[PDB]
């Protein structure tokens, strides 16, 4: 896999997102932070400083 996920956890690659906003609402992957998200304003507004640097607990589906 990538890199792996004993590391911490398995961190996601929010290398994408990349709108001025963020459209639609869909919540892919699992928060260690207890918050089922994934997007610019669920992840990515938390993983550069919205939380913490997340590390999805879940890479998929819960």
């Given amino acids: 896999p990538q890199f792996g996920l004993f590391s ?6 929010c290398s994408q997102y990349r ?3 963020c459209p639609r609402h869909f ?6 932070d207890m918050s089922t998200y994934a ?3 669920t992840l ?6 919205g ?3 997340i590390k999805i607990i ?5």
């Fill in 8 to 13: 911490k956890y398995r961190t996601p690659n």
């Fill in 19 to 21: 709108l001025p906003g």
């Fill in 27 to 32: 919540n892919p992957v699992c928060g260690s």
């Fill in 39 to 41: 997007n610019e304003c």
């Fill in 44 to 49: 990515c507004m938390k993983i550069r400083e």
């Fill in 51 to 53: 939380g913490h640097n």
């Fill in 58 to 62: 879940r890479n998929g589906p819960c």
